[PDB]
Symmetry: D3
Subunit: 306 residues, 6 copies
Amino acid sequence: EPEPQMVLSPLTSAAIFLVVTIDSGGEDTVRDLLSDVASLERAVGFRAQPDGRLSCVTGIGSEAWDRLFSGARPAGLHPFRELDGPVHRAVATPGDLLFHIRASRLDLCFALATEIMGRLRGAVTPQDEVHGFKYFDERDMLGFVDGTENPTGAAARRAVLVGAEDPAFAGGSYAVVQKYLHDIDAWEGLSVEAQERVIGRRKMTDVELSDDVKPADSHVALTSVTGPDGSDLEILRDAMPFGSVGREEFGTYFIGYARTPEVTETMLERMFLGTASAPHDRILDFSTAVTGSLFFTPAADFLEDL
Amino acid sequence: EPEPQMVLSPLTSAAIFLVVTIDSGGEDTVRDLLSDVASLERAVGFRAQPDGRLSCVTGIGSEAWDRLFSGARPAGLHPFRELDGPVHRAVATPGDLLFHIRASRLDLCFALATEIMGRLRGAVTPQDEVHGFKYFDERDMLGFVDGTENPTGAAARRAVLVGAEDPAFAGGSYAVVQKYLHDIDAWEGLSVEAQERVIGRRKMTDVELSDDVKPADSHVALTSVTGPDGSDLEILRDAMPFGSVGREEFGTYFIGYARTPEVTETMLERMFLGTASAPHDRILDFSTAVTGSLFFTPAADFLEDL
Amino acid sequence: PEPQMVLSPLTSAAIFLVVTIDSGGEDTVRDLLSDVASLERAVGFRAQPDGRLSCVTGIGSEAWDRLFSGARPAGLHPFRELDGPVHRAVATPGDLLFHIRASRLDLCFALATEIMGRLRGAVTPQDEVHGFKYFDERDMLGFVDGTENPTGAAARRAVLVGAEDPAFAGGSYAVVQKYLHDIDAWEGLSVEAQERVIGRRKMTDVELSDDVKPADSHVALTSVTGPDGSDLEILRDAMPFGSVGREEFGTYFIGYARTPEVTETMLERMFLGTASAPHDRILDFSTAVTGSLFFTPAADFLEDLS
Amino acid sequence: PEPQMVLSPLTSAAIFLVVTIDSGGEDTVRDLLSDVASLERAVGFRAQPDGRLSCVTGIGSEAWDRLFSGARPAGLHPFRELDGPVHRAVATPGDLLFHIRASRLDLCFALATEIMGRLRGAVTPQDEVHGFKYFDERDMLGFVDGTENPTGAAARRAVLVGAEDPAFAGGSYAVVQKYLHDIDAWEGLSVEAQERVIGRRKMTDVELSDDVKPADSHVALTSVTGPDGSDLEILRDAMPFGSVGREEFGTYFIGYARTPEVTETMLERMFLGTASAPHDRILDFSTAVTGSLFFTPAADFLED
Amino acid sequence: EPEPQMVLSPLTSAAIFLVVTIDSGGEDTVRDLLSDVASLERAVGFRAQPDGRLSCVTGIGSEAWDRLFSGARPAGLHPFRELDGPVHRAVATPGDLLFHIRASRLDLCFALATEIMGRLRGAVTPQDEVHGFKYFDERDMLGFVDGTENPTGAAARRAVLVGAEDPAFAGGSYAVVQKYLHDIDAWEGLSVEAQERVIGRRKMTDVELSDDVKPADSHVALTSVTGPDGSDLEILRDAMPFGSVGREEFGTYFIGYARTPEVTETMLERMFLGTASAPHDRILDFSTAVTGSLFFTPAADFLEDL
Amino acid sequence: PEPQMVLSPLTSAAIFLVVTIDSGGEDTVRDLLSDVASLERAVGFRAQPDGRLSCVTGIGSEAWDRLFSGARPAGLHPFRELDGPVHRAVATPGDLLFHIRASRLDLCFALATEIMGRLRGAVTPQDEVHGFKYFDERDMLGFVDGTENPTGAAARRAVLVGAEDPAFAGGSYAVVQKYLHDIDAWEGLSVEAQERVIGRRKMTDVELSDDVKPADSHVALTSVTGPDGSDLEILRDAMPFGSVGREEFGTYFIGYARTPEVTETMLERMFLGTASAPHDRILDFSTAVTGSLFFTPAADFLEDL
Ligand code: HEM
Ligand code: HEM
Ligand code: HEM
Ligand code: HEM
Ligand code: HEM
């Protein structure tokens, strides 16, 4: 088989997201680093096992792929598609490489990011760097549990990993990232019952609203999608709180993994453009997107044979 | 009889340092928050006990003290003293209020900082915000164990807490903060043996160099000071690594607590001005101070009384 | 096919709930069964990774006939009462079993509260037991309990239905019995006499040699080989329970097997005896007061209902 | 003098046992009392450091007179029944209290088994409750419970008898009530309405400001100031309990104080009300079915 | 007030006991090491906190004291006295220095022992080296819980630390060590009931036998001693199992601390010489002493000043 | 076929036992082998989940012929002595290996006591070592030890016998060597000089680039490719041991492989050298004083006795 990267990681309380662009003539340095990234992960992580749980998932953008490699391309790889809805806009921002670094402690993430960027100095320019921390009861910046309905085990593998539909790229995945800033003053102006009608789940107990109370423009109603054959279309999320108390910056760094970008893109279209039944996802009246990029995360053996 | 704030904290792997100035007319809002800060600490921290270990130490600058309170001044409270050495400078920067927030996780520090700054918006301006993380083996940004010779138990109480010498302020302490950025490039150019001659201890095993081979301009030699009676003068440190790999910012946020500022200021004078035997502390040839402030951290009952 | 969480990691707390379905309660019950996996996620996700909450849901032979209109699992029948010369294994009513396990009683109790909230008016409670395991895996008799359970691949082969009943693959069969002990009589035996009842050493949990182990010891009678001389295995998670006021000291027995015939062969040898043994000596200090049999279907069977 | 483990670390499991002493049981009881600290060590030591097992032993007003001759602790009396306009605090029988706490129910149950084994034939059980805390210190009403308890030095001064009753120094007074909740009615309230009953925000556990806090909120009525304007404090370790089958959802209340006067002033305000408040709004969703008062002596009193 | 060595330690699962003699002319090397040993403890231990729990207690024999120091002798310090009972003998064996090294892991003990013996090679001759391990439920080599009736908190300090009776040595303690080998074959030939009559406690539940059943020659009866007034004389023990399965060596390395040696030596006289009511301690019919030594463990400041 | 616990989680304590079978001891040994998995559960289950106790049982080449009739595992032979120009890999006697691992020394000790209790009078001890790993996975030379071990499916492929020897599938081959270090000489090197001996950075455990890594560094010599250009890998769990009184500072080496040919190729390059290197520089600070080879069968092979 092909061996996947660590897309299906165990639960982690800390994360670093790094997005860079490749400077002109930086290609060779980048290909050198990509062949060594799993070795750097083992070197930083092994001495802190079994509790460290350090991993790095490496992603490549559509334009970067054409600069790095000749030949066949993953079937779904394109630049993030901007959405200009009647009220809300999903922006596309630059990004050639993604490092999704996760662990039980921020210091491990930071040590592996230091070795990665040390190897890339002179070849890349930083676009975004976020240090994520999860709240102790899995809560996000809106005060709701975040992760509950992710798929697990076999269902997760089927949802996230490329298989026989794109055989040359089997064991790969597609990652969409969006950094959101929240308007917390507006959000805290709602009662708890009004907040629940935005999300579609109870705040304190995390039980889903009944089919008879759940609004058509609630976040959970719009991100719930069935395919033609009536199967659930699922993604795997590992969204993380971040920000700065001084600048009054309260955010959610969103990442979703899927076997095809079509599933993630159908969810984003319903959220930003709406449906017959809903103008837009009510979560967006308290959340502004400031970045948007799409990456292909290849099989581990693809990176190792560079 | 008077109950100290949590100056003598158990070991914590995360910290937030917040330094603010009080805007004109902000005094009353500030006094109201100071009387509630212990209540806010319990509200965020109690539900995560016993492993959260959340604490907040609140400090007040010399000029802020005169705007907030009439009556007696703590005996040792003055503005941080700038040090103009022939090569190295210890700069003085503005700060009226210090919040030293510590816990076993960054998310708890961040939740308490959010409640504090929520009460003060409109009354203060942020000067510095740092999110610190400790390495898994108590290492700092230079790769040395950091904290080894701090005093513990009764020796720590004697070294840090004001007593009979200033009876109205007993159970208080004095906090000096400096943010340092390191030249990691220059530091990693040294052999391990050359790094040991800068610090004064072995890197991997943290054994002190013997009295005959320890250089006179090593960090350990210069911060070792005896009083007139031949007593060792000690401080309590809780320095934290911080940074951003994208902006190449690798730092140490220094905080030191002492029963009198004269002990910390004797250490800073030896480091920046030198002695007959040493021009300056060699650690300063790889470390630049960008902030400097001095605060009195009163007994908890002093803050509760307002 | 995705099993329910039959093969769970070690748990120190459990709630057993046995209920009968009132006339006309069927539709409410079918609605709850389609939601029970989502209720497990709602209560459990925010307490991960340490909570380790799971629920295994079972259906009795007569309830199956009232709920579902197609094929029956091949081994599902009402518990068979065993009328021995001395000891009786009684059959008591039960339509639905909830086997709820976690690292803490409060999590089991929160999931039981949500389940029973959905069933109020549709079911009548028959049994509710709150179990606790001793810190060194000991039971109410003071012996280590679980030692010879199968693990890994052997456990899956022993417990999960496969090719022999393909429509119900990934299911299992659960036998429950509540036992009350005569602890006064038990504690009147010497430790050596207790060892001859169980078949293992009390302090060190070493199996008695084939030369000393009596024919009517618990371990001799629950050791059974199939036609090829292969060991027939069950998976147990028996839990102590009781009340010191009422002098109630119990063991709540649950055993899981791929076919009821394995557990029923073990009960026949215990209660009816063999050529070599009148009955299991453990029964001279243990009285069964309940007995029921349940089919625990594959998770996808419960999810795909109406 | 060495106190019993009144000031315990946080515990997630508890057994409450209340018994009466049968006639002629006195000597069996006095034998167990001299050995109960030994039994605590016997069951607990092998499960350190995580077990955190302790047992606090209390004696009622009537029982004291049957067991001991000489001076009585100054504040020891039978629980006082409160007959309010709407809500009633009942007085129920109890001679001995065992407050058993640990990180796991199985350790509580092991110590309870050895204690009741020693007392079989001398005592009648009145109450047995097995308590569990929710993983974020929440109680049966879904609020954080314990937040304003005193800690360290403040806790010692609030809870332990000192120079005012020198023969009984290092003792405390324990008040217990078992409450059953109407959870149906409680879950019918909005979160905002629940906050106005308790006097704290539900999700973040921040006290309501003095301008929005209702006068008949639980926190407003259990706030009492002394002559010098000091806070009068108690130490609580109230525990959820119940049965899902029988629809029984409860809080087993225990409060410790250096004098019963502090706890009894709080109960009078809750049940009788004041000029400003009819009664504590928490009592429109909580019914007391037991009430008892115990003196918890110093460890050395029990030993000698 | 004087700072004790870490005599009152938290529970530790591993230990190294080192006993050495000072070679002729080794005195100055030894005095140099003694002034550094607390700094070596911090150097090895700090980076492994909070779980390491590493400490070292340093003791000095009666004859060594006279070679190392001029001035006052601690009032209770004398050579261990041999006990020649009718059946059992307590031997006295040489030792000038004791290192009692404890931690949560053997590797920490070993790293500190390596640094100590590195400083002394050429100055000392090793007499005994023992690597101790406690069983997971505090059980010893005889299978009984060991430590239960040790004093804690304030009672422990009163029992172990020298006070105003010998003011120059306040915060010191007296350590007696004996290495015992067990006859395991003979011991395991006893029933649990017979083992309980030797120890004086129930094996599984660690409940003390009643005054009416506890034999007069049981270990617990003979090591229970009351002073001239009425009160219990206590010592603090941290005895550890040790052995070699190859050599058939199964041992208990006994260490007891007391404020005066008279308490420990009264316990030894009752065990070896017996009373009116008992010939000897029944534990001695399964345990042979092969070493016996007495040390004074001074206050930490005594060692630091020299 | 259910393997023994070769692929164990990380363990901080170990006991290694090597014994020879006395005349007439065969029957006692066969009895103990059929019971050893049940003794592991008896000592370990009560201490789960933190105990992580396991025992791996191995049998030497000569012992196999005394214990069992029928087929021999294809790769089982006596350890081959290497007499290199400077350094020697010695062979020492061994019929049975017990590789006992846990999170605490006391659990290893309890299981070794029950095993040796069953064998008293049937076996003679050759070697007994009590191992301890440093808290940050460091070894006796002060380097992280384990970093490049294979994990998951790559580990199973590297260690477990498959279709090449079908009657012995789920078995493995263990090579043991006890090493004593000259720590005085080692600690006389600068950190930079030590890195050039190992082939990795000491503090950060980053591999030296192919351009700086010397040809006689330990990592260069124990890196081996097959005909197919694929890496040949082993699974190691080498453990520090010593006695501070005796000045004994050691590494007890154990390596597991699907075939002995992989471990034997690594030992030949270390002790005999290559075109580019006289010998492994790690051997100028490490002396081998034991050497033995064992087959560790599938668990069901031992049970069906
Ligand atoms: C870049 C900033 C700094 C770094 C990375 C740093 C790092 C260290 C390190 C590695 C040690 C040795 C281990 C220990 O005992 O903790 C140490 C010791 C110490 N440092 Fe610093 N230090 C810094 C700044 C300061 C400053 C500004 C002061 C005083 C104002 C200071 C006072 C001390 C003292 C008192 C010790 C203990 C000396 C002894 O062994 O007795 N440090 N520092
Ligand atoms: C009072 C109720 C029971 C108690 C207290 C109890 C206790 C025990 C104990 C202490 C063991 C030995 C350790 C171990 O788990 O391996 C054991 C083993 C066993 N018990 Fe029971 N048991 C009970 C009832 C039952 C019942 C009703 C069954 C089956 C229908 C059962 C089946 C087994 C089996 C299969 C084993 C393992 C046998 C082997 O070594 O292969 N037990 N039980
Ligand atoms: C159904 C029974 C009870 C429930 C569920 C309950 C629940 C709570 C809650 C959630 C708090 C707020 C957070 C905290 O400080 O813990 C609280 C505070 C408190 N309760 Fe209660 N309580 C009950 C009965 C009682 C009784 C009977 C008393 C006194 C006799 C009492 C005295 C207090 C005190 C003193 C406070 C703290 C007030 C302050 O902030 O100073 N409670 N209780
Ligand atoms: C191989 C040697 C020894 C073994 C295996 C051993 C074992 C134990 C055990 C199992 C207990 C009961 C549980 C407890 O409270 O710790 C105990 C108690 C005790 N042991 Fe020993 N012991 C040994 C030698 C000694 C020596 C040589 C002395 C005194 C010089 C001693 C003094 C004590 C004392 C003072 C107690 C506490 C008794 C009480 O007050 O209840 N032991 N020992
Ligand atoms: C004498 C004591 C020994 C010590 C102290 C030692 C130490 C080390 C250390 C520190 C590493 C680096 C980290 C790692 O990947 O584990 C390593 C790697 C390794 N050692 Fe050794 N080793 C020893 C003997 C041996 C022996 C006898 C063999 C083989 C027969 C061997 C084969 C290996 C292999 C295969 C690797 C991984 C190579 C790679 O990176 O691909 N070692 N050893």
